[PDB]
Structure to design on (397 residues):
């Protein structure tokens, strides 16, 4: 599925944090894999369902808010409008996040984490993902710069040629004006001369 | 038309005669292009600053493959080259031709390979390029 | 990317007005040349008729 580089710094320990490798089901209310690693141990985990209605009588939200709550708990930092606890129970391999509103605190859903060791390989995979996405973003950066400056020089050249043409249409207009004027003047001179010649008997 | 047969013309009466004559632009650009060229030759009207991109004898590469009039790739000013090729008095030509005399490297300078490859089929060589100064050598 | 798009649209609109001005020049030159051609044809026919009548003299 998709890994995401998001470190929700655990208050219980700094050496471990829930990086995002979410394998989301039909909804984030349903289970998905979150892997938090230490370098000396690692832990995946899944979220138990139904954990939505527990706040429904508590603060009376609406449905689907749990999906966004889970997404912003997975992403870096806590929710912009939702309080979360970021920690890890190494003893039980379990994660939990909060939800408080309207003058009373309450307990949002939680991660039933599963302990899977060998943090070395998963850390290697995460850092490789980081490096690769940095590289692709830099490639997009340089390509966008190239196309941007290319359209810049195209714009400058078309501006110059457009100014040339707008001056030149009237320039050739007046030039052709005078040219036709003088040519027809010469034609009329020929006509006058031929009339004078024909005048003779 | 108000254009006398004896008393000479000026700007005003020429404009009035012209406007009185029906608006005349319906034929193919190349026939009237040749007409303008012939009138410029007979009347020394080639001296117009517009006389090198709209009517006769210039070659270019507006296509990734010449003799292939259908390929078009963004990343250059082929459109702008075509838009210019209809202004001053040199013909829009970007196809393998023999009687063409002018070959000019386009703003898509990456087709110097194409320009030279089809130059073998051409009987005219490429000049060191310089209206007449975007990337051009008609001199 | 935003700079790319804005410069693309700037280049496109100036190339479009370039199209408009070039086409306007083409039409204007066409009109001028055609009307002058008609007037010159009239002049040359008049000159030819004058030659004919002078020959008849």
């Amino acid at each position: 599925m998709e890994r995401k580089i998001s470190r929700i710094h655990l208050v219980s320990e700094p050496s471990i944090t829930h990086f995002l490798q979410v394998s989301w089901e039909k909804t984030l209310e349903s289970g998905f894999v979150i892997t938090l690693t230490d370098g000396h141990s690692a832990w995946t985990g899944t979220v138990s369902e139904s954990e939505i209605s527990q706040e429904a009588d508590d603060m009376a939200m609406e449905k689907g808010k749990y999906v966004g709550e889970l997404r912003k708990a997975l992403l870096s930092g806590a929710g912009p409008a939702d309080v979360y606890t970021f920690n890890f129970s190494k003893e039980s391999c379990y994660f939990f996040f909060e939800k408080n509103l309207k003058d009373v605190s309450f307990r949002l859903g939680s991660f039933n984490l599963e302990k899977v060791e060998n943090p070395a390989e998963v850390i290697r995979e995460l850092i490789c993902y980081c490096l690769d996405t940095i590289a692709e973003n830099q490639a997009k950066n340089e390509h966008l710069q190239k196309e941007n400056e290319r359209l810049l020089r195209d714009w400058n050249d078309v501006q110059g040629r457009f100014e040339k043409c707008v001056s030149a249409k009237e320039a050739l207009e007046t030039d052709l004006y005078k040219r036709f004027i003088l040519v027809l003047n010469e034609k009329k001179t020929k006509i006058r001369s031929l009339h004078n010649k024909l005048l003779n008997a | 038309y108000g254009d006398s047969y004896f008393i000479d013309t000026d700007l005003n009466q020429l404009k009035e005669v012209f406007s009185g004559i029906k608006n005349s632009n319906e034929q193919t650009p190349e026939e009237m292009a040749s007409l303008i060229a012939d009138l410029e030759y007979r009347y020394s009207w080639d001296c117009s600053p517009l006389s090198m991109f709209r009517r006769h004898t210039v070659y270019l590469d507006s296509y990734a493959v010449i003799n292939d009039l259908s390929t078009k790739n963004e990343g250059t000013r082929l459109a702008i080259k075509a838009l210019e090729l209809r202004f001053h008095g040199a013909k829009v030509v970007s196809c393998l031709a023999e009687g063409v005399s002018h070959v000019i490297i386009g703003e898509d300078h990456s087709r110097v390979a194409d320009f030279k490859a089809f130059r073998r089929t051409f009987k005219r060589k490429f000049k060191i390029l310089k209206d007449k100064c975007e990337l051009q050598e008609e001199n």
